[PDB]
Symmetry: C2
Subunit: 206 residues, 2 copies
């Protein structure tokens, strides 16, 4: 029942902190620590906690790598040709099978830069990833109605910025098509890299 502005404000307030950092060990440890904060972010995405825990976990399990990637790309926008894994861990291209994903992450930053992706748009995109990556009756209906609400909210953000109706639906499409590439990176990422579900369940107990 939230308004678009209340949706945006809830997502903005829910943003996780930027954590700080042998290379792969460090990146794995950073990712593991960010995942905890991801869980607490997800609990604040409006609509998420109305799902069963089993469904909260399947969605997090499907989405977590995409969410880490889009977060990395978002905080890397202002660092052309580099990835800001942490404020103390800025890596460029020159830093097997890694450069291919690195280039794909860099291409995403470049796309966000070309689009001038806004922060309010970023948090909507992350929320969509959370609710969408695992959707493939009543529980899915609810997921789709929350997803619909985020679509309403993105359009509202674009109207408030003064875009024409045409530009609104063009930009909405451009943003959602980026999510196909983020999925693609996640799949390649998974290839390149106790069930995670048990870990996610434990994390939900704080």
């Amino acid at each position: 029942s939230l308004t678009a502005d209340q949706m945006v404000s809830a997502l903005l307030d829910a943003e996780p902190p930027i954590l700080y950092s042998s290379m792969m060990g460090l990146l794995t440890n950073l990712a593991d620590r960010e995942l905890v904060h991801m869980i607490n972010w997800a609990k604040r995405v409006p609509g998420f906690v109305d799902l069963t825990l089993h469904d909260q976990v399947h969605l997090l399990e499907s989405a977590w790598l995409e969410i880490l990637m889009i977060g990395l790309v978002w905080r890397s926008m202002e660092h052309p040709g580099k990835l800001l894994f942490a404020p103390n861990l800025l890596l460029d291209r020159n830093q097997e099978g890694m450069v291919e994903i690195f280039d794909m992450l860099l291409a995403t930053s470049s796309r966000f830069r070309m689009m001038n992706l806004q922060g309010e748009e970023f948090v909507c995109l992350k929320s969509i990833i959370l609710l969408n990556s695992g959707v493939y009756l009543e529980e899915k209906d609810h997921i789709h109605r929350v997803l619909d609400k985020i679509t309403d909210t993105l359009i509202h953000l674009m109207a408030k910025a003064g875009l024409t109706l045409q530009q609104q639906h063009q930009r909405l499409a451009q943003l959602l098509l980026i999510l196909s590439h983020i999925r693609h990176m996640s799949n390649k990422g998974m290839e390149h890299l106790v069930p995670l579900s048990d870990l996610l369940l434990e994390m939900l107990d704080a």
Copy 2:
């Protein structure tokens, strides 16, 4: 291409549609050979269809090749899902090759992809996906799948592709408006359809893993004018 009305975009895409091909005129042991032969014959028609997607032949040959290398499996899959939409629980690879889940169980890792395709077909069925929407979505896959994995020329190329993608977005919205959808419903349905493309990409990546081109794409795309 950038001057087409939405109705002219729909018309060009509908006319460009490839034919529905058949399998040879069956067994678990011969099934993969039949599916591979079907895909190979469909790929030829794909190329011809791509050349008829407005704006596609404005690109360099190298970029046309790149886009089709990136998108061909997704395009085969979305075509399959569309043909299968009115056959619940089954995949209509061809009019004479309608397969159920159990026929996939015979090949390792096959049923997982089969189930994802079935769920996409069920989702299109639930949304009552229209043929005019389908051809827009397939044209989006062609132009979008490879656009993040490509000089001043390259920048011009990418800008062109995004302008054509934008025109197909306008066309999708025009279609939904003509169908009587409120403006909220139009934006929502647009988003729902585009998010399914994320899942089609997911299936393609899993499918490529399971299945395990360029100069062949070249030879059909690099036609002479004789």
